[PDB]
């Protein structure tokens, strides 16, 4: 019973956040769950099903554990829009989250509400701190759609060894979310010089000019994409596409249309 216990809940989500975790390197996911933590509940991966895993969750939340929540929590009209084993997702989270030693909201859905919370939000979905704040829950927000695997795993490690990290106003760990994408973008020199691509097929785009005039929201977006990269190889702007602000609260409505400034 040596490794720290982690309980991982899936709510209103696309599971892209769970997948991003599988992309972790140093440690790799096998090292993470065999040597670093004990993954005591995770629906995507577990061998048993039905009643057997619900019993596992019941036992696990009696101990000292960290709670990880993926996806938004539907609260519209009583919250029946999302159910697991007959239970509304709100009730599951309300039971589990307040018991944890610490809670992590992974992905923009869990932090701020995400894609389903975009207008007109038919399920009345909200984020973790908005749903469970009255119960005393104060979650660390790992934002992104999905976040960089290093921002999640780095945060778990930090929690295990150093404690609660310092957060910004939106609950994001300052050690990862302290600067905008734009501050660290290799195309910053073009932006300041006024060197923009005006269409995706122009010589300027082929030359790698700044994408600001094609919609890029880097200047308003807090994340570490340019320096960290994804999958150790790439990131949106390097691949010629504007940033769509995926780590910002309400980005779906506040930063679209995506292809205009």
């Amino acid at each position: 019973k040596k490794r720290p216990s982690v309980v991982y809940l899936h709510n209103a989500e696309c599971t892209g956040c769970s997948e991003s975790v599988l992309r972790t390197v140093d440690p790799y996911v096998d090292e993470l769950i065999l040597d670093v933590i004990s993954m005591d509940y995770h629906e995507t991966l577990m061998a048993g099903a039905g009643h057997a895993v619900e019993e596992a969750l019941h036992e696990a939340i009696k101990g000292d554990f960290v709670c990880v929540i993926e996806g938004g929590i539907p609260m519209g009209d009583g919250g029946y829009w999302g159910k697991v084993g007959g239970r509304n997702m709100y009730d599951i989270c309300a039971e589990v989250a307040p018991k944890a030693k610490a809670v992590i909201a992974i992905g923009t859905c869990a932090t701020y509400g995400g894609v389903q919370a975009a207008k007109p939000n038919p399920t009345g979905t909200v984020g973790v701190n908005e749903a469970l704040g009255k119960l005393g829950v104060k979650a660390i927000n790992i934002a992104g759609c999905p976040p960089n695997p290093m921002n999640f795993v780095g945060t778990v490690v930090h929690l295990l060894t150093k404690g609660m990290p310092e957060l910004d106003k939106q609950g994001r760990p300052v050690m990862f979310f302290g600067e905008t994408v734009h501050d660290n973008c290799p195309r910053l020199k073009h932006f300041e010089a006024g060197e923009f691509a005006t269409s995706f097929g122009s010589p300027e785009a082929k030359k790698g000019y700044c994408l600001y005039e094609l919609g890029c929201k880097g200047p308003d977006t807090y994340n570490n994409c340019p320096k960290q990269l994804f999958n150790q190889v790439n990131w949106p702007v390097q691949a010629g596409h504007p940033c769509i602000a995926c780590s910002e609260p309400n980005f779906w409505d506040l930063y679209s249309p995506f292809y205009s400034a």
């Binding site: 019973k1 040596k2 490794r3 989500e13 599971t15 892209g16 997948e19 991003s20 599988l22 992309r23 790799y28 096998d30 065999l34 993954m39 005591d40 629906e43 995507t44 991966l45 577990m46 061998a47 048993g48 099903a49 039905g50 057997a52 895993v53 019993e55 596992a56 829009w81 999302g82 159910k83 697991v84 084993g85 995400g114 894609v115 389903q116 975009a118 038919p122 399920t123 999905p146 269409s199 995706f200 097929g201 785009a205 082929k206 790698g208 994804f230 999958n231 150790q232 190889v233 790439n234 990131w235 949106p236 390097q238 691949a239 010629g240 596409h241 779906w252 679209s256 249309p257 995506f258």
Partner: protein, 530 residues
Amino acid sequence: NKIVVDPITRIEGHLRIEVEVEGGKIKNAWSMSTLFRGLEMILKGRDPRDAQHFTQRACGVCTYVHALASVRAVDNCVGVKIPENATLMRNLTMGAQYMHDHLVHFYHLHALDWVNVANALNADPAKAARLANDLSPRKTTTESLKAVQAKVKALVESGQLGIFTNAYFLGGHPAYVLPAEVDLIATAHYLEALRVQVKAARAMAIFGAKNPHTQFTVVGGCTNYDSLRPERIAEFRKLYKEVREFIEQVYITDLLAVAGFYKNWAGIGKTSNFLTCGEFPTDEYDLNSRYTPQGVIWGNDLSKVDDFNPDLIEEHVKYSWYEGADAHHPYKGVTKPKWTEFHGEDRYSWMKAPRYKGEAFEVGPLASVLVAYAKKHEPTVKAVDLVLKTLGVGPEALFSTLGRTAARGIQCLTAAQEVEVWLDKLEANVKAGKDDLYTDWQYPTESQGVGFVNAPRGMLSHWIVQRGGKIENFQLVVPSTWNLGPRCAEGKLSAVEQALIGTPIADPKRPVEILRTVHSYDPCIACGVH
């Protein structure tokens, strides 16, 4: 006698299975999807160019595929012809997705229905290694299998089983019949595949910007000029070869090995109608230009393949949580949610019920492999013949849960084999100074368009109606909607509901037989409902 499995694990999303049992076999079934998000409602009135970004978030497991379907639908309603390099790049990215998706499904989502990890501790490792060496061309040592055994041991002795907690196979289970040596090999490969999948997703990100959730497509083509550098192309190539070798040498051989011990599953989970739109086109306006072909098979009959006709699609809601009971072709799709509780008014799911000419169909790898086999697609013919000769069965064995599982492996293989072709073409184009990725386009005053994608789970289609550069209607009909949706207004069971009838249940408290059939469809509930 009622059995309920909720939650179904090792899938994407929120599924509940209810079954009726009599004499130890399933006599009726209900496929119940229990999360609704409403992406179609959110899309209404928005900019068509935003669509691919919202719809990609339909699902993060089959990432990319909804963005593809959306730019294909908007490309289509606008009449643009994207350049050859965009077509090549998009096909390459889809190939990498097939490679990544099917690997993770077999080992990490499906295998635990067949493999008793705990029994791996009873394996003689030297004997397991020798068996490993008979199964595949790469060399395995006794020592590496001992290490794996040691890792499983630390886990069990720690008392923290983690994801193995309360497994159906703990304390023995009459339906798990693998010899300990095979359980050990499968477990070792399960762990190895966790590292291999990381390489498949990296390959994808070289063109796709990132995984999960790519960011390189636009209406009119692609944006990723950076990936056109010899260096980037060479880096894709090297990762692509490693993942391909693992698929060829470990995945496929593991699949046949395990299947061999479950030959009886060739008589379980039979279904009848199959369809696919095909994938990997040379001509974005002609399904018959596709590397894997479009086609429709009626009632298990492989001698006659009809042409896919998208005019024949209608989605039903009589048994789902939506208003009323009318069915609509997707250009006139309606999304009006209305909850009534489990079985209230007999309604039991947030999925609509897609029907083709009024009939229920199965889509996905088996369906895709059957059509290509019927049409004499040579790569598929060779792969199928190998499975069949290896298992000692005729083609009739394919119409089953065992066949559905084998077909996923074949689909993975035929895609991986072709990827090198598209890559060489892209490279040759670039070397010759042809580096176009984008074509300019303009909105018609008013138009409609449709994008067809054969995703790893099957036939995907996005349907747009736009006026003045604004979305008037945008509907998704997705492979798991077909496979796992509920009954239609005619009361016809869906592929998965029908596949479950007849299923034998050894232990009602641990009904692994239900998981085996459900997992063979590779369910995705966020996809199915959106």
